[PDB]
């Protein structure tokens, strides 16, 4: 029941962000929420080409690092690669089919496009610091500890996509599919979308920032400067991506968009809280693998754990959630040099 | 049965373009078909911003145009706007779920993204030539002649998407849903993808090019020059987009990628031909109506009809189809001035 060009002349300023009539005409002369048009303009103003970045000195620097530091650096980089591989396709496959205002539709496509640039930047780094990129990329798929840390991201998206297909194909109601009773509830699908957004918020707001701190620890040592320039550019894009999901979520919570979404945000509040607590614990658990062969001055499991707590509280407060962790000052204030 | 991250380590150089294992790692250090990596690189190198183009004199040119010429210009722009609105979302929603090699997956996202820039540029033009853009944007959805010229485009994508959902949800076989039999066949879904791609090839390679003739006819008269600069950049992008679908279609019909797709292509050779001819016919009908209130300087319904027949022959030959029209040389060689590429 999805269509690539809905034939009803509708007032796009009055549709909800999600689940209304699919967008027909892509126009940018007006917006229900100008924040998405501002985000598109800012992301386009940030356009960068990874291949232009000089990473010729990173190979010298990398091969010079002691073995445990190569492990820390590459294990981090493989996780960034996994996340952006998922973020390049998922907003388009999972969110695009449910969007009903043009400014949010184009924002999601722009945001997903910018993630493919990040992926292309990891290939640029990887091909220039190791002799066989294939060993690095293949490990991303099979590495148990990497998958463990990301557990639940692809699951969430996949479940939303499957429920969306049932909805678009069958409509609301209880159906009989190959003899099994299948319930399609729009309210349940709105909850699934809503929690998928909260999960994406945690992914960009927390998981990527923990990874940035690990990358910048090398830059503070005056090493892997090509990587650092790229991570700085990637972080600048991620700041916009998380601004986008924070606004989607806070707008839904306000009751100014779909009223049912404001009810759902309030009703599913413990689940929001729980998914942030679980993601933080996963980022902490990654330290055992990250520092398996030794830690570095200023970067070890304890510092990583303190920073996870610090940044999780900040991101949760930004979308209205209670704080799970003891408050603390930033354990790694040197990161502010790199996050500009 | 689709996943955003397939957990099976697979050799991405050996998957088919479509229907294989969904792409897990996005890497660009190797590819099965390097044409898609070359297209991504070229499209990224062509990045442009509509707001960077001065359209300040287009308002006065448009206003001084005779009424039938305003009608020609605006009707043509509304159709370009409809086509890129569809092209901004559709390659992503329709093709991404079926791609199994990374370079093609990123090419599609890059191609679709470049179309949103086109849509943004039409807003930049429209806002700068009319008092109230809403009059122009609302007429796109229900404009009778526009619907007639673009008739069928959304239905091909829509049917492909629907059949893809059934396939991912239920898999191949004879199923039942609420008392009715629903048959899912991978062969039929491959055929729907093949025809959808042939239609996208006609959209970008013939429908858009006919619209470019209209826009550049004004540029030749030194009018609507802001619009001209923007259509020039859009046409440079479209040359890449059609290069991408020509390669997808030729790799599918040659049999080098999926033997079954080669058998399918041969099997719908006649259908594909008649659809191409139908697209050409819709474009002629649009011209006939558009030049009803009066011809323009340097363009009329017959000249445009010849251009449609000329470009249709070239594009059909490029994807191995027989030529439907009498061969002729380009009836409007001046257009080459504007079609870099
Ligand atoms: Hg999600
Ligand atoms: Hg870290
Ligand atoms: Hg919440
Ligand atoms: Hg801690
Ligand atoms: Hg298609
Ligand atoms: Hg199509
Ligand atoms: Hg025309
Ligand atoms: Hg014209
Ligand atoms: Hg024309
Ligand atoms: Hg065909
Ligand atoms: Hg066929
Ligand atoms: Hg064919
Ligand atoms: Hg065709
Ligand atoms: Hg014709
Ligand atoms: Mn990213
Ligand atoms: Mn991001
Ligand atoms: Mn376009
Ligand atoms: Mn195009």
Written in H, E and C, the secondary structure of chain A is CCCCCCCCCCCHHHCCCECCCCCCCCCCCCCCCHHHHHHHHHHHHCCCCHHHCCCHHHHHHHHHCCHHHHHHHHHHHHHHHHHHHHHHHHHHHHHHHHECCHHHHHHHHHHHHHHHHHHHHHHHHHHHHCCCHHHHHHHHHHCHHHHHHHCCHHHHHHHHHHHHHHHHHHCCEEEEECCEEEEECHHHHHHHHHHHHHHHHHHHHHHHHHHHHHHHHHHCCCCCHHHHHHHHHHHHHHHHHHHHHHHHHHHHHHCCCCHHHHHHHHHCHHHHHHHHHHHHHHHHHHHHHHCCCCCECCECHHHHHHHHHHHHHHHHHHCCCCCCCCCCCCCCCCHHHHHC
The structure tokens listed for B144 are 């009778």
Rounded Cα gap, residues B230 and B121, in angstroms: 7
Q: Please tell me whether residue B328 adopts helix, strand or coil conformation.
A: coil
The C-alpha angle with vertex B202 and arms to B198 and B208, in degrees rounded to 5, equals 150
Contact criterion met (CB below 8 Å) for A227 and A218 = yes
Please name the residue that has the structure tokens 């209670």: A322
Contact criterion met (CB below 8 Å) for A107 and A39 = yes
The closest of B85, B93, B338, B76 to B207, measured between CA atoms, is B76
Contact criterion met (CB below 8 Å) for B16 and B100 = yes
User: A259-267 vs A225-254: helix axis angle to the nearest 10?
Assistant: 110
Of residues B30, B84, B112, nearest to A109 (C-beta): B112
Of residues B3, B44, B97, nearest to A49 (C-beta): B44
Residue B132 to residues A227, B77, B83, B324: CA-CA distances in angstroms? 48, 15, 21, 43
Cross-chain residue pair A96–B92, CB shorter than 8 Å = yes
Residue A182 to residues A166, A178, B183: CA-CA distances in angstroms? 9, 10, 18
Contact criterion met (CB below 8 Å) for A12 and A23 = yes
Please name the residue that has the structure tokens 């470049």: B114
Contact criterion met (CB below 8 Å) for B235 and B212 = yes
d(CA B43, nearest CA chain A) in Å: 11
Number of alpha carbons in the 13 Å side-chain half-sphere of residue A82: 30
Name the strands in the sheet holding A173-177, side by side, starting at the edge strand that comes first in the sequence: A180-184, A173-177, B173-177, B180-184
- The catalytic site residues of B sit at 122
Q: Which of residues 69-108 of A touch B (CB under 8 A)?
A: 81-82, 84-86, 88-90, 92-94, 96-97, 105-106
Q: Please tell me whether residue B18 adopts helix, strand or coil conformation.
A: strand
Rounded Cα gap, residues A227 and A238, in angstroms: 16
Write out chain B residues lying below 8 Å of A86, CB-based. Answer: 4-5
The closest of B331, B320, B113, B297 to B210, measured between CA atoms, is B331
The hierarchical CATH code for the domain A1-340 is 1.10.620.20
The C-alpha angle with vertex B181 and arms to B180 and B184, in degrees rounded to 5, equals 140
**If you count them, how many residues does chain B have?**
341
CB atoms within 10 A of CB A176: 12
Rounded Cα gap, residues A110 and B65, in angstroms: 36
> A69: which residues sit within 8 A by CB, 6+ positions away?
A218, A296
Q: Compute CA B290 distance to the chain's CA centroid, rounded to the nearest angstrom.
A: 22
Of residues A25, A47, A142, nearest to B140 (C-beta): A25
Write out chain A residues lying below 8 Å of B184, CB-based. Answer: none
Rounded Cα gap, residues B341 and B336, in angstroms: 9
Burial of B249 (0-12, 13-18, 19+ CB in 10 A): buried
Please name the residue that has the structure tokens 């080409």: A49
**Phi then psi dihedrals of residue B18, to 5 deg:** -135, 155
Q: Which of residues 155-184 of B touch A (CB under 8 A)?
A: 157-158, 161-162, 165-166, 168-170, 175-179
The closest of B42, B20, B43 to B32, measured between CA atoms, is B20
Contact criterion met (CB below 8 Å) for A250 and A319 = yes
Q: Say whether B68 counts as a known binding-site residue.
A: no
Residue A219 to residues A118, A210, B227, B291: CA-CA distances in angstroms? 18, 15, 46, 64
The structure tokens listed for A315 are 């991101």
The DSSP H or E segment spanning B180 is strand B180-184
Rounded Cα gap, residues B236 and B243, in angstroms: 11
Contact criterion met (CB below 8 Å) for A89 and B4 = yes
Q: Say whether B204 counts as a known binding-site residue.
A: yes
Fold of the CATH domain B1-341: Ribonucleotide Reductase, subunit A (1.10.620)
Cross-chain residue pair A154–B4, CB shorter than 8 Å = yes
Rounded Cα gap, residues A115 and A127, in angstroms: 19
- Helix ranges (H only) for chain B are 34-45, 58-64, 67-90, 102-129, 133-142, 144-149, 153-170, 186-202, 208-220, 225-254, 259-267, 269-290, 301-318
Rounded Cα gap, residues B190 and A47, in angstroms: 36
Please name the residue that has the structure tokens 């232009």: A52
User: B67-90 vs B208-220: helix axis angle to the nearest 10?
Assistant: 140
Rounded Cα gap, residues B58 and A106, in angstroms: 26
Contact criterion met (CB below 8 Å) for A99 and B93 = no
Contact criterion met (CB below 8 Å) for B105 and B23 = yes
| φ/ψ bin of B179: left (φ > 0), alpha (ψ from -120 to 50), beta (otherwise) | left
**If you count them, how many residues does chain A have?**
340
Contact criterion met (CB below 8 Å) for B95 and A108 = no
The structure tokens listed for B74 are 């605006």
* Concatenated DSSP letters of B242-277: HHHHHHHHHHHHHSSS-HHHHHHHHHTHHHHHHHHH
Contact criterion met (CB below 8 Å) for A160 and A196 = yes
DSSP state of B22: P
DSSP state of B323: P
What is the number of the ligand closest to the CA of B216? 8
Residue A225 to residues A60, A247, A291, B143: CA-CA distances in angstroms? 11, 33, 22, 55
Burial of A323 (0-12, 13-18, 19+ CB in 10 A): middle
What is the number of the ligand closest to the CA of B205? 18
Q: Does B199 touch chain A (CB under 8 A)?
A: no
Rounded Cα gap, residues A17 and A215, in angstroms: 35
Q: Please tell me whether residue B215 adopts helix, strand or coil conformation.
A: helix
Q: Say whether A118 counts as a known binding-site residue.
A: yes
Instruction: State the pairing for strand pair B173-177/B180-184.
Output: antiparallel
The C-alpha angle with vertex A9 and arms to B228 and A249, in degrees rounded to 5, equals 90
Contact criterion met (CB below 8 Å) for B171 and B1 = yes
Residues β-bridged to residue B190: none
The closest of B271, B281, B132 to B196, measured between CA atoms, is B271
Residue B340 to residues A79, B34, B54, B114, B336: CA-CA distances in angstroms? 42, 23, 20, 17, 7
Experimental method: X-ray
Q: What resolution in angstroms does the PDB record give? A: 1.9
DSSP state of B23: P
Contact criterion met (CB below 8 Å) for B50 and B230 = yes
Contact criterion met (CB below 8 Å) for A125 and A227 = yes
Write out chain B residues lying below 8 Å of A100, CB-based. Answer: none
The structure tokens listed for B245 are 């679908």
**Phi then psi dihedrals of residue B244, to 5 deg:** -65, -50
The structure tokens listed for A137 are 């990329």
DSSP state of B59: H
Q: Catalytic residue, from A122, A156, A157, A209: name it.
A: A122
Q: Please tell me whether residue B83 adopts helix, strand or coil conformation.
A: helix
The structure tokens listed for A290 are 């990250």
């Amino acid at each position: 029941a999805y269509t690539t060009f809905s034939q009803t002349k509708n007032d796009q300023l009055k549709e909800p962000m999600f689940f209304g009539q699919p967008v027909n005409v892509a126009r940018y002369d007006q917006q229900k929420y100008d924040i998405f048009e501002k985000l598109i303009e800012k992301q386009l103003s940030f356009f960068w080409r990874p291949e232009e970045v000089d990473v010729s000195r990173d190979r010298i620097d990398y091969q010079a690092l002691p073995e445990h530091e190569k492990h820390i650096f590459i294990s981090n980089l493989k996780y960034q690669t996994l996340l952006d591989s998922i973020q390049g396709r998922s907003p388009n496959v999972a969110l695009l089919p449910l969007i009903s205002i043009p400014e949010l539709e184009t924002w999601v496509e722009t945001w997903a496009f910018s993630e493919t640039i990040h992926s292309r930047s990891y290939t640029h780094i990887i091909r220039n610091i190791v002799n066989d990129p294939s060993v690095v990329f293949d490990d991303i798929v099979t590495n148990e500890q990497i998958q463990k840390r990301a557990e639940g991201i692809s699951s969430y998206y996949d479940e939303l996509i499957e429920m969306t297909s049932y909805w678009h194909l069958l409509g609301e109601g209880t159906h009989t599919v190959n003899g099994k009773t299948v319930t399609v509830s729009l309210r349940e699908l709105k909850k699934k979308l809503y929690l998928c957004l909260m999960s994406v918020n945690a992914l960009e707001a927390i998981r990527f920032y923990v990874s940035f701190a690990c990358s910048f620890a090398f830059a503070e040592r005056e090493l892997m400067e090509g990587n650092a320039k790229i991570i700085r550019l990637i972080a600048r894009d991620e700041a916009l991506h998380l601004t986008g999901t924070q606004h989607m979520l806070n707008l839904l919570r306000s009751g100014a968009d779909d009223p049912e979404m404001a009810e759902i945000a309030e009703e599913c509040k413990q689940e929001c809280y729980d998914l942030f607590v679980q993601a933080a614990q996963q980022e902490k658990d990654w330290a055992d693998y990250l520092f398996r062969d030794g830690s570095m001055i200023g970067l070890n499991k304890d510092i990583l754990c303190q920073y996870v707590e610090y940044i999780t509280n900040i991101r949760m407060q930004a979308v209205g959630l209670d704080l799970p962790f003891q408050t603390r000052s930033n354990p790694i204030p040197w990161i502010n040099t790199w996050l500009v």
